[model samples]
Target chain A: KKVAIILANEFEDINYSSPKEALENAGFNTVVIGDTANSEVVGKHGEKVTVDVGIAEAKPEDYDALLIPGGFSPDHLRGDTEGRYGTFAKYFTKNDVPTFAICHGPQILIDTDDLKGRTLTAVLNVRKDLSNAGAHVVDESVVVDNNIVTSRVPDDLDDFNREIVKQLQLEHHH
Target chain B: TKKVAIILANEFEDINYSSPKEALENAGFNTVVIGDTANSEVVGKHGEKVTVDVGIAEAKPEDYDALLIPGGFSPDHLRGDTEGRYGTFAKYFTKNDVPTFAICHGPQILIDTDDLKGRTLTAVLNVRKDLSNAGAHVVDESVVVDNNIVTSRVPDDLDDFNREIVKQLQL
Candidate 1:
């Protein structure tokens, strides 16, 4: 199966890689999606990844699921001048694709207008903003609500990555 | 007459806007307030009200000789526009080599411009790391100017922020 990883400059280093490692290890293909194609995005701690697909060419139906890695990238994409990133993310929710986000990852979902009554978790800093966006915010290592999976901080990536890989396996069976 | 554009949002530090703006006007430059909406009013953190002269979409970069971005909560909201109106508006000042004044969190908006690398600047204590990560040579001082961009720390440094912008515009 294929998944789309949404990213921007200044993303959390491990938040992106941990689950990416798990999903890829599970034999899933992942494409790095960002604002610009072929541009490198740096993590807050200095890890880097090159964008494989830009929003301009991305069609949400092309991928099976979505991943938002968190850090400052969530703000960057959701707050895009054109709102294209946020609009693009809506494809996953509208179509019931299994989506995973960790740390600051859940922040981007607020722009989807699908957070109301949905249970999720995020970094402590953005938890209130998620609540304000009408999400039922929790303080767990990992929380799952329907097609969404969210986690707290780096320490919880173990649980976070596991849930994503586990959820996708269930999808493939049926 | 000459004009300067002030990009801002609600909850901005009042003095950051009032002081530098007052100085610019005193120096005989007209100040135009730009925000998400034209004719809408935004309130400062300290409770002062400022009316928007024009919306960012409608405001022309060629109409102004300089740009001022005040600190506080305003820059946070302003930066939220990313490469949208606020970011595009900010890039115009930087690209044109116009007097670009950003104080405290004000410089936060410039992060979206992707032009901060190797630039000498200073901002609020909390914002210095982000500025430095953008490849700026972050400094600890009352004010730092690299080319047409001028930046300062917080309200304690507002006088320096005020003094330097006027000097830049006078040129």
Candidate 2:
């Protein structure tokens, strides 16, 4: 019923778009949670999307799916080292909840170890990380693995949306 | 004054593509958007259009101090210009020792050059192996800086890539 999007300093904007729009179009309740509260995060090209909630306000269990939009920004999310930057510690992948990561977003899946032996794709530069994380890297538009869905980049959004819709429908029914 | 040229290719990431120009301009570096031809709008990988200033054939690397190659789908498309003048401009960046920065697919063009070998860098997610195979050290991080080369993961890391370029220039 609810979807949580974890965004932080420097999250890629387009990575934020396709899934959010797709989910919204499908009538899912979405919320943007930043690394911290009270800060307006500027997206890729200086466009700002205010954080609706902080990590403190939202737990992975509260949402049906966890979405992490990739960008250089969420690298800061992983900086915590204590877990919970869009990774599996948040329970999206770890708890078997529905999870979606686009482009840089999928890096979190890799970070969360969800991509271990799973097939996924990310931005070309980050693909190595996913490959090393035990994920089979593909150059395709979007990849769906159970509750996890990933796309390459904004260019891959079209396929990403289709995959997300398919995953969402399958999960909601299950 | 350091004149910086960014190769705005067909289907470049608009955020990754545009922020560097703004940051360079903010740092007092003259930035120009160049593509395959002059007077045509380059479509970003996300279907955004970026108006270009000059054609890649017309812009010489010697005229600039630094070159930024942003990745999207542009480099993949531009890589086909094997003999065309625009295709080889990336070579001039290395030949001239101009500090270069590439993110995501930006380094695909670098694959055609020998300079990518033995460089320590990072890019979006996919190009790491290609970079490592090119003899570059594939690293995992937001940004990687080895010598004058700077690279990052995806468009979200555009700020890191941008700041690194400015930091490398010590501007």
Candidate 3:
């Protein structure tokens, strides 16, 4: 399946690496999409990766699954000048694409303004924002609501990847 | 039905593997994920686990219609296998002239085969110069096909990569 992993130039290593590896190992292709100003993204731990494409080139409709790794990347992605990332998030939610967000990844979804009445989880720092946006925020490692999957932090990657793969597999089979 | 052998190990790029695998499967081709260990599970750089369909020792190049090598640290790891695992495996595709698709860091494996001495291809920035130094006519493009081999730069080029691969297969 074609899985889109949207991130920024600066991100959390574990948040990106864990799920990316897991998804690829599970026999799914994972693409790394970032903003235009950057041809590559660097992690907090100095891990550098070449960005596959800029946000402007990414079309949510072409992807089967979406993943947003946590860290400050969400902040940059949410504030993308083109506003495409935010729109992409809205499209994913609206179209029921299997979406996975970890740690601060849910922060970007705040701009989509479509989280109302939905249940999800995120890092403790962003819990209040999620609640304020009309989401049923919970304190948990991982949470699944229909096609959306979320996790609290890097520590929850094991559960995060497992759930994302499971959801993707379900979509693949059907 | 066409069968394609995909060489994989730990730390492969998720996009490189999944995009092509799904495209080929949807196009009515079979992809066998081959690892160093038969039926063993290999993890991607981000932690995705996939069960191996066969081991390198058991895989035969002639049994498949094509070959696929996804980028990530897996290519580096494969290239480092001085024990002859990758060396023997890569030789099959080059020698038999089967359709092959490699992306990003994937061409790193071709260095060991000595088949790229005069081939034209492209890869991730880090590997491009190296491939050129090895005598390949490397270009900068989303997809580059030389003879029966298809190469691409990164995940962003997956659509073009898969399209080219499928096109090559259909031909």
Best by DockQ: 2
Give RMSD to native, each candidate.
Answer: 15.2, 8.3, 18.4
In the range B6-61, model 2's lDDT, one tens digit per residue, is 88767677788778888888998888888878888888757878778888767877
Docking class of 2: incorrect
After TM-score superposition, the amount by which residue A41's alpha carbon in candidate 3 deviates from its true location, in angstroms, is 13
lDDT per residue as tens, model 3, B1-171: 789989998879887888899999999999999888888988887787888998887888789888899987677556545465775787788777889889988987776666877799998764564566457898989999998999998899999999999998899
Model 1 lDDT tens row, B17-80: 9998999999899999999899999999789999999998889999999999998768766755
Give per-residue lDDT, candidate 1, residue B62.
Answer: 93
Residue-level lDDT of model 2, residues A55-86, one tens digit each, is 76666677777888877565556555455564
Q: Native-vs-model 2 lDDT?
A: 0.72
Candidate 3 local lDDT, A84-171, one digit each (tens): 7878888898888898999878877766777889999987655645765679999788899999999987788889989999998898
TM-score of each: 0.55, 0.53, 0.51
Complex DockQ, candidate 2: 0.06
